[PDB]
């Protein structure tokens, strides 16, 4: 009785209708594979939007969660817990920063990074306490701003922000040359993943970072999606020889086992933070820390950055060959195993969705974004043989469509 | 060696200084008790700000986490998972709502409740898109701030501009400053006033919900069924960040799939944990336990107050309680009292300088509760 349709109908009846998932009901995951309720096996080519970099149900991450959950999971920050210090030392040493501020969700970490940058710009740089601006390339704070109303009780422009095009050095230099004195930070993703996969021009991140330093503006690398080996380096900034002033991590920081996010910065920035303001009950809890330490160890011990780099090159090379055989795919873009294909149809068309249904029938799970883009992002633990099998599945699906 | 000071120094060096915790380093919890790195045992009288209502490391909740984490912890909402539907059916049936929207954090759920009320007021009530206002209580355009526990102020705002108002968003008890219990009838009259003026009543029960005040949600004390219910914290027993917004179909009908989503909201691990945490509350009758033990606790603390000039009053409902220390908010007395309580085996922390929250896990026994009273008495009388 309790088949896939049974669960879908439960959610229709009792759950808000705020999502449109691909119609598959998953109940087990192991490594690169997931199984639906009827027992069919699939390659996961979404990795829960690049949170499951270490594979589903990684034995080391499971083990860390189970160990810590039976000891102590939450004290709040009213007290110290014995795991947070160990984790803080680990991650700051690993990435080369003095300090980390732990949070739960990606949005919390981005919000916290911006608040930290504004406070720095007041305490150190000298901008008035409501006058600092943040340069952004996308709507990083969707749902929490007033443009015309914000939902947080405690051309169109968003006060406090300057929006410029992504991958546009001239636009950044124009803003900095004219009003860098008003600017606390530039907040940018090394690859934009919201509307697909937008890889910027070679050199964009490094030039942006250098321009920010020249103009006394913090460079904030939002690596919630790009971080933790996905692009072929521990963080995508490393591809560009950038060390950001503030680093934002999330998603795969926990392998997807627990919502863990982080903001890293050196003392000259982080020490503007003082006790007092209203904070997070769960941020930095010992269960989160035990999970994140294990998730980082998997990435380093299994050399997942090198694996994502090598297999990503192979993947894009093979997909480029497929593109030459079909009129259905316009281009493939990405870094490491963060890749996506643009389908040769309009964003209002059903083609990419139907291609994802066909991929599913052939044993590979992906979902469109913005109508005509398909993200292709498996866990980084995929083997070369499995990767080439996935290429064969994609080839078969495309060539038979 | 890795003693308490070692871990405190690690955090000073490598962690942001955004908190000033009580100087105790905890490494184990069971039920009402926690142990520090040196092995000293304490009663936890904060419950992680009322998230650990079911006690630390509750076996049924640990069980649920282990079972599900071993199987599948995260899919994202790009696909269905096999636990969310069962959890949605469970919590909506338990609380008497048609639908639930699952989230991670308390602030997420509050913001989602606000966004939902505004969308309702546009599609159903007819207010323009960015024109609906939300009434809230003092503890920001588009929000009307009135004093807490003030029916007259609410009535004045409604009489003057209910036509432009989507909702009133209120906590059944305010836990921010300390524990501010409103007057008898405040919540019910507020709920009735909102209905009369075609305004949604949103109960923020992130702190008060899940048995802490002696009922499954504090609205039940007052015979209020809110239009939108916000839950958080103890929904997971503290094992996982889980929050929720519940409402009937007349409100949830306005929801359609959007452009931005939550990766972790509604994931199968969160759902397995929350189902177990709810089962603990019902199976162990923790609402009844909190009601009965809360009455005993306030009665015993009132006796202690007779013996000292240090404590002004005790207030609260269920096991959400607090004491006001007889000193200024800028003084160190409450902090120093908490250091002394710690030495005598009970952990609490001040808020707003001169208030101490007293909120143990709901699984505490009468014998333990009276022992805690004895610890507080000893600490006060020896101070």
From TrEMBL, chain B:
Lineage top rank: taxon: Bacteria
Cellular component, GO annotation: cytoplasm
Database matches in PROSITE patterns: AA_TRANSFER_CLASS_3
Cofactor (UniProt): pyridoxal 5'-phosphate
Enzyme nomenclature, EC number: 2.6.1.13
Associated pathway: Amino-acid biosynthesis; L-proline biosynthesis; L-glutamate 5-semialdehyde from L-ornithine: step 1/1
Matches recorded under Pfam families: Aminotran_3 (PF00202)
MF-aspect GO terms: identical protein binding; ornithine aminotransferase activity; pyridoxal phosphate binding
Broadest EC class assigned to this enzyme: transferase
GO BP, sorted A to Z: L-arginine catabolic process to L-glutamate; L-arginine catabolic process to proline via ornithine; L-proline biosynthetic process
Protein keywords: Aminotransferase, Pyridoxal phosphate, Transferase
Family: Belongs to the class-III pyridoxal-phosphate-dependent aminotransferase family.
Protein name: ornithine aminotransferase
Species for this entry: Elizabethkingia anophelis NUHP1
Organismal lineage: Bacteria, Pseudomonadati, Bacteroidota, Flavobacteriia, Flavobacteriales
């Amino acid at each position: 009785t309790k088949n896939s349709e049974y669960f879908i109908e439960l959610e229709e009846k009792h759950g808000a209708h705020n999502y449109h998932p691909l119609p598959v009901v998953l109940d087990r995951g192991e490594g690169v594979f997931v199984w639906d309720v009827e027992g069919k096996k699939y390659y996961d080519f979404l990795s829960a939007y690049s949170a499951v970099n270490q594979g589903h149900s990684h034995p080391k991450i499971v083990e860390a969660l189970v160990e810590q959950a039976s000891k102590l999971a939450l004290t709040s920050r009213a007290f110290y817990n014995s795991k947070l210090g160990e984790y803080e030392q680990k991650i700051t040493s690993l990435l080369g920063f003095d300090k980390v501020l732990p949070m739960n969700s990606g949005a919390e970490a981005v919000e916290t990074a911006v608040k930290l940058a504004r406070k720095w710009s007041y305490e150190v740089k000298g901008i008035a306490e409501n006058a600092a601006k943040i340069i952004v390339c996308e709507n990083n704070f969707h749902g929490r701003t007033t443009t015309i109303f914000s939902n947080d009780p405690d051309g169109p422009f968003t006060p406090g922000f300057i929006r410029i095009p992504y991958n546009d050095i001239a636009a950044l230099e124009e803003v900095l040359s004219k009003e860098a004195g008003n600017i606390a930070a530039f907040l940018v993703e090394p690859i934009q993943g919201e509307a697909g996969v937008y890889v910027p021009n070679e050199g964009f991140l490094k030039q942006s970072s250098e321009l920010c330093k020249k103009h006394n503006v913090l460079f904030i690398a939002d690596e919630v999606q790009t971080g933790i080996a996905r692009t072929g380096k521990l963080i995508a900034c490393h591809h560009e020889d950038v060390q950001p002033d503030i680093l934002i991590l999330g998603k795969a920081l926990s392998g997807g086992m627990y919502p863990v996010s982080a903001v890293l910065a050196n003392n000259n920035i982080m020490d503007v933070i003082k006790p007092g303001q209203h904070g997070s009950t769960f941020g930095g809890n010992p269960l989160a820390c035990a999970v994140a330490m294990a998730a980082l160890d998997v990435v380093q011990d299994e050399k997942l950055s090198e694996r994502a780099e090598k297999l990503g090159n192979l993947f894009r090379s093979e997909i480029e060959k497929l593109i030459e055989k079909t009129d259905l795919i316009t281009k493939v873009r990405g870094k490491g195993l963060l890749n996506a294909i643009l389908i040769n149809d309009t964003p209002d068309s059903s083609t990419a969705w139907n291609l994802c249904l066909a991929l599913k029938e052939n044993g590979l799970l992906a979902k469109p974004t913005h109508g005509n883009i398909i993200r292709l992002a498996p866990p980084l633990v995929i083997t070369e043989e499995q990767l080439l099998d996935c290429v064969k599945i994609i080839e078969k699906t495309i060539l038979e469509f």
